[PDB]
Amino acid sequence: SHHWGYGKHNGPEHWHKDFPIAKGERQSPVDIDTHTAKYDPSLKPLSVSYDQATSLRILNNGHAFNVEFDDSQDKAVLKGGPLDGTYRLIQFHFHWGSLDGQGSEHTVDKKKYAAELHLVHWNTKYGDFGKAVQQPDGLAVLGIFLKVGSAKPGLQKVVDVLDSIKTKGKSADFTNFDPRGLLPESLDYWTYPGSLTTPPLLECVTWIVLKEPISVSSEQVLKFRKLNFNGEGEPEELMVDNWRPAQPLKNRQIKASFK
Ligand SMILES: [Cu+2]
Ligand SMILES: [Cu+2]
Numbered sequence: 001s002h003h004w005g006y007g008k009h010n011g012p013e014h015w016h017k018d019f020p021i022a023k024g025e026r027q028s029p030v031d032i033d034t035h036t037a038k039y040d041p042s043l044k045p046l047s048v049s050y051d052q053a054t055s056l057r058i059l060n061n062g063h064a065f066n067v068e069f070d071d072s073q074d075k076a077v078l079k080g081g082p083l084d085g086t087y088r089l090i091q092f093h094f095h096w097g098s099l100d101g102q103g104s105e106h107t108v109d110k111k112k113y114a115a116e117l118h119l120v121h122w123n124t125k126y127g128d129f130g131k132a133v134q135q136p137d138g139l140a141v142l143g144i145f146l147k148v149g150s151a152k153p154g155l156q157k158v159v160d161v162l163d164s165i166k167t168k169g170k171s172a173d174f175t176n177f178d179p180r181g182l183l184p185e186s187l188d189y190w191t192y193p194g195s196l197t198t199p200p201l202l203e204c205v206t207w208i209v210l211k212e213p214i215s216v217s218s219e220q221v222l223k224f225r226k227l228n229f230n231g232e233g234e235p236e237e238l239m240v241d242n243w244r245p246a247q248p249l250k251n252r253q254i255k256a257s258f259k
């Protein structure tokens, strides 16, 4: 299923016609009301183990750009916190705005950040990603907010390759990239059960959203905004505002790892 996007004629308000789960019981993103989130002393320490991460390639897929990892072994994994067992990193990507005052998917007391990073992991008990996305605990996505201020040195290698993947369907080698350079100092987080935030909107995700944003420079985010939704030789449509707004919380509680 093709043709969904972020424009007025195929954006988030239309997705439910082809993806009825868009109106489901555990859709993402959500607004994080920080005063209603409750500290959960049962949460375990989160473990982000990216030392042996093996990046492979960066791809413009027409919706965002994905940095892809070799997930054929436990090389980069997420464990602990709300999670049972081991989740393997498969890709990361971002969502961002046309302006610094919008771009994130999750919001914090209705505050929109300039962008949001998603590090996507699948539960190794299900053998591969495709089977993991048929399970209610198949995926874990680590979300990190971006605000505009000082430059993030560990983002710059990503920014510098974007020129080579301007249009949909372009890819480039992207080996030897260390995703640890994209994390904030603190691993304090909020967690809740949700979904993919793009079609097919599957309800498989344990969301882990870090409280501390990373700072990126205006120049870094401006380069995200030079990408294109369209393919080569087609009319240019800047890749901006590729975020889904907050969805109803319904019968969910957001838990905090910190007091
Ligand atoms: Cu289709
Ligand atoms: Cu697509």
Ligand SMILES: [Zn+2]
Pocket: 093, 094, 095, 118, 197
């Ligand atoms: Zn995402």
